[PDB]
Amino acid sequence: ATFEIVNRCSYTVWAAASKGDAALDAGGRQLNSGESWTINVEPGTNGGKIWARTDCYFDDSGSGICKTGDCGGLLRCKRFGRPPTTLAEFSLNQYGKDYIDISNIKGFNVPMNFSPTTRGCRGVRCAADIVGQCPAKLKAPGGGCNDACTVFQTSEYCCTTGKCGPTEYSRFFKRLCPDAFSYVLDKPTTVTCPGSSNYRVTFCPTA
């Protein structure tokens, strides 16, 4: 499947794409404002994620650090990135269907629209000013708004027992972005699309 990743933000982001134990395509690239990066993701990919990283520095070997979304210091991510990170998530060709969603379960750093470029389903977006409105206890010095699990590490925020409810903190992400997962057992906002759809991820879709 092809994904076009577009930076509409007025600032540079370093895009990342991983299935958590391997890079998807090159795994990461710098995107200046307005740049597009087209990647190919093998059919059947389960548990893929794409995110933006902010304020990164990399040397000539692609080793460095980012203030949000850092994936063990690499330009080309093999692993998932450090919260806070707005996530585009996807499982492809699962019994003839593709499943996409946006998640705030690992916090928010950059607004995002995640839409099919092919026919037969709709896109999802989280474009509100979550960092601006972030509760003081969730604010990341880095930039970004962390999820409560990352900050407090409780069974309730992390849903570690498989039983947990919405919280003051999850309700905040949900009020600003109703179409993004706000906690692990949130009522699913997954979109089902035709198997082998193609997609576009846009950072700062409103910008």
Domain that holds residue 127: 1-207
* CB-CB contact of 86 with 104 (8 Å): yes
d(CA 204, CA 207): 5
Q: Cα(103)–Cα(95) distance, rounded to whole angstroms?
A: 23
Distance CA 76, CA 54 (A): 14
| Residues contacting 85, CB < 8 A, separation 6+ | 51, 52, 53, 68, 69, 106, 107, 108, 109, 144
CATH number of the domain encompassing residue 131: 2.60.110.10
- Interior angle at CA 204, CA 201 and CA 207, nearest 5: 135
Of the chain, the end-to-end C-alpha distance in Å amounts to 27
Experimental technique of record? X-ray
Backbone angles phi, psi at 66, to 5 degrees: -130, 150
Contacts of 184 (CB under 8 A, 6+ apart): 105, 158, 159, 164
How many angstroms separate the CA atoms of 41 and 26, rounded?
10
Q: What are phi and psi of 116, to 5 degrees?
A: -70, 145
**Data resolution in angstroms:** 1.9
Contact status, residue 201 vs residue 88, Cβ threshold 8 Å: yes
d(CA 10, CA 34): 8
Q: Tell me which DSSP letter residue 78 carries.
A: S
Domains in the chain: how many in total? 1
- CA nearest 49: which of 75, 77, 74? 77
Strands (E), the chain: 2-7, 13-18, 23-31, 36-40, 48-58, 64-68, 87-94, 97-103, 112-116, 124-126, 180-181, 191-194, 199-203
